[PDB]
Amino acid sequence: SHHGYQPFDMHNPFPAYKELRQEEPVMFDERIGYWVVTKYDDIKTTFDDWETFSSENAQAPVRKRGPQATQIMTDGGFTAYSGLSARIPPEHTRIRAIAQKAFTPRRYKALEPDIRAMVIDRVEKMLANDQHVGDMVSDLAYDIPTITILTLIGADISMVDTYKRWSDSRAAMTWGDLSDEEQIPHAHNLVEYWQECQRMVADAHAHGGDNLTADLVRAQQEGQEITDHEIASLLYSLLFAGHETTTTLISNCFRVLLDHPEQWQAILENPKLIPAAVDEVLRYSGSIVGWRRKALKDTEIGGVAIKEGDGVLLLMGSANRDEARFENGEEFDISRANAREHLSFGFGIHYCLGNMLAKLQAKICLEEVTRLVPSLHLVADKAIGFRENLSFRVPTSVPVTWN
Numbered sequence: 001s002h003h004g005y006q007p008f009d010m011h012n013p014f015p016a017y018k019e020l021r022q023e024e025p026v027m028f029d030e031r032i033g034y035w036v037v038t039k040y041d042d043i044k045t046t047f048d049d050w051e052t053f054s055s056e057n058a059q060a061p062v063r064k065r066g067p068q069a070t071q072i073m074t075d076g077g078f079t080a081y082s083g084l085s086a087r088i089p090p091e092h093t094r095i096r097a098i099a100q101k102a103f104t105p106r107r108y109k110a111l112e113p114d115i116r117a118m119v120i121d122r123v124e125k126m127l128a129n130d131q132h133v134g135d136m137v138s139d140l141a142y143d144i145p146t147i148t149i150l151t152l153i154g155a156d157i158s159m160v161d162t163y164k165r166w167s168d169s170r171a172a173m174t175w176g177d178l179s180d181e182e183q184i185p186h187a188h189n190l191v192e193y194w195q196e197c198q199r200m201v202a203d204a205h206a207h208g209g210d211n212l213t214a215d216l217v218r219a220q221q222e223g224q225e226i227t228d229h230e231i232a233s234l235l236y237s238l239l240f241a242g243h244e245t246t247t248t249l250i251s252n253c254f255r256v257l258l259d260h261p262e263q264w265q266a267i268l269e270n271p272k273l274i275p276a277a278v279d280e281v282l283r284y285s286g287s288i289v290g291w292r293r294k295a296l297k298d299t300e301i302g303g304v305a306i307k308e309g310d311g312v313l314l315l316m317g318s319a320n321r322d323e324a325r326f327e328n329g330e331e332f333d334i335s336r337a338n339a340r341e342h343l344s345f346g347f348g349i350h351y352c353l354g355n356m357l358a359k360l361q362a363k364i365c366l367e368e369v370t371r372l373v374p375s376l377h378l379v380a381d382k383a384i385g386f387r388e389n390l391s392f393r394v395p396t397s398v399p400v401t402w403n
């Protein structure tokens with residue numbers, strides 16, 4: 001049964017990863033139509049070889065878009081595909097160089113005090129609950145990265161819930177195992193999402209502003225080569241990638257660390273261990289466990305022949321456990337010296353644009369929650385569910401209690 005691999009089952013895929021690494025490290029899975037690759041060396045090499053393995057299918061729906069969803073999105077004027085992750089050179093190179101300028105550790109330093117204050121506010125609100133029960137997703141991880149990226153882009157922060165609906169739909173439409181009928185509500189949401197991206201660009205043309213959208217329009221007006229459609233597509237990209245995965249990371253920091261109370265206790269006694277803890281959470285529980293490529297010519301992965309046009313699914317979640325790179329890879333250890341060799345941000349020309357902003361927010365959340373709620377405790381591992389998806393491993397809640 002494909003060595004136990006269930007492509008959309010996100011609850012605990014690592015036993016199957018381990019059997020694949022040992023038994024069939026490059027496996028053709030006809031259930032999804034991809035070569036499934038699970039070893040670190042093969043995955044890093046494939047990421048590096050962008051001339052042979054293009055990202056152009058990284059935003060293609062796993063399940064073909066059905067007739068009604070297709071009509072909805074055509075009639076709704078949905079013309080988006082990918083701001084960056086599935087573009088290829090030369091367009092990718094040009095657009096990434098322009099987008100990169102806004103995401104530097106210096107441009108976050110002015111944001112850290114605001115993020116930290118917001119974290120403390122959310123923590124205090126949670127601790128006021130009557131039952132002394134909380135949920136690290138809805139009570140913290142849900143809002144913090146979303147407000148951060150909305151503020152950076154120039155969207156009104158009153159639409160957090162709308163953007164979560166739109167992000168849920170993008171994740172489900174593109175990587176979910178959806179029937180034609182199940183695609184319909186998501187198709188309507190994607191139409192709305194794209195129209196708002198277009199509106200924000202038009203608004204920046206008309207009224208300027210102090211935000212990323214207005215800065216990108218200013219770059220265009222000052223001679224830089226980027227179109228309105230490419231700017232709107234960058235919003236489409238950042239208003240999804242800029243919070244969906246970070247919410248998951250924050251959620252997983254508490255899920256995994258509270259599952260390992262000796263290491264929770266370690267960061268209580270020494271907050272300086274928190275950055276390395278976040279590194280090991282990214283290795284052990286990355287927000288994305290698999291990412292796609294397309295072979296541009298007949299080639300090989302791990303000595304297995306792959307035909308031009310074949311799709312490839314790189315399971316970074318498996319790479320990050322590979323014993324050839326990570327000794328005792330199935331164990332969570334915040335002192336792991338080479339945890340930052342993980343592939344949860346990818347590798348190469350498409351390497352995550354916002355990885356430092358994600359880690360910053362995870363650090364701040366862990367710093368303030370450990371300070372204000374040292375007695376935080378999980379209700380139960382068996383109380384955490386994961387939505388089905390090919391690529392994104394999202395815990396739906398993280399129920400917690402405290403003294």
Ligand code: HEM
Nearest residue numbers: 084085241242245249287345346347350351352353354358
């Ligand atoms: C825990 C948080 C995050 C994880 C695990 C993550 C993961 C990834 C992965 C796997 C890729 C594809 C890498 C590749 O193809 O080589 C990627 C690309 C990208 N990410 Fe992140 N990401 C995170 C947070 C963010 C944030 C916070 C932002 C924005 C502030 C962001 C923006 C992007 C963009 C724009 C790309 C496309 C870059 C390109 O194609 O050149 N991501 N990310």
Ligand SMILES: CCc1ccc(OP(=O)(O)O)cc1
Nearest residue numbers: 059082083084085086237241
């Ligand atoms: C986090 C991975 C990711 C997902 C979607 C993205 O959007 P886009 O393909 O650049 O529009 C960009 C990156």
